[PDB]
């Protein structure tokens, strides 16, 4: 129902945490802009992000992953990579968009 968007680095902002805390079963979360770093395997927050794959559908914006120097291979398995066209789609598939800034 809800498509949450997190555009900030999980190492700088508490946004990612707050979003994962209130997003519920069946919701979608999209990581874009500096939010991208949270979808990368190996970081301090891989565990909690991975945990989230349980009840949530996770997505990261390709364009921002690449711009920051990471290919789809550096991403945490389970998190889907989408482009702006896909980002648009996510917003129409879900009922409401909620930006965590």
């Amino acid at each position: 129902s809800i498509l949450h968007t997190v555009n900030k680095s999980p190492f700088e902002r508490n946004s990612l945490e707050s979003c994962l805390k209130f997003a519920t079963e069946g919701a979608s979360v999209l990581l874009f802009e500096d939010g991208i770093y949270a979808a990368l395997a190996g970081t301090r927050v891989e565990s909690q992000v991975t945990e989230a794959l349980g009840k949530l559908k996770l997505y990261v914006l390709g364009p921002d992953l690449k711009a920051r120097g990471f290919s789809d291979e550096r991403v945490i398995p389970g998190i889907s990579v989408v482009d702006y066209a896909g980002f648009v789609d996510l917003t129409t598939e879900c009922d409401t968009v909620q930006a965590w800034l």
């Binding site: 555009n7 500096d34 702006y84 066209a85 648009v88 917003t91 129409t92 968009v97």
Partner: protein
Amino acid sequence: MKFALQINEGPYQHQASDSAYQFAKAALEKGHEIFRVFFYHDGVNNSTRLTTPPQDDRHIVNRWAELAEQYELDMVVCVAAAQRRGIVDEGEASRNGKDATNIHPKFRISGLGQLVEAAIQADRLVVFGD
């Protein structure tokens, strides 16, 4: 679908505007409708015609203007937000007693109500900010 994009930050300083632009162009190309692009907070600064950005990089303001031109987008600039930061058009110049204007002709200044208005008319409200 009908969209309502909200941009709260200025050009270049934050990626917000670029993202919304990319979002918009991708949505428009897909056949969707952008009901209104509303600039609030530092967002109102995406409307000045006085920029001269590096040529080897994107010209944010003109880009928005071109896209607005191509798809007849209704781009609104919060008036109160504008008075605080310095965005001025014919009206504002006249009402505030300013010796010049700096708004790009493709953006219009209006009320915050136009933001709420779009929220009601559009199916989706996508907010881009910090």
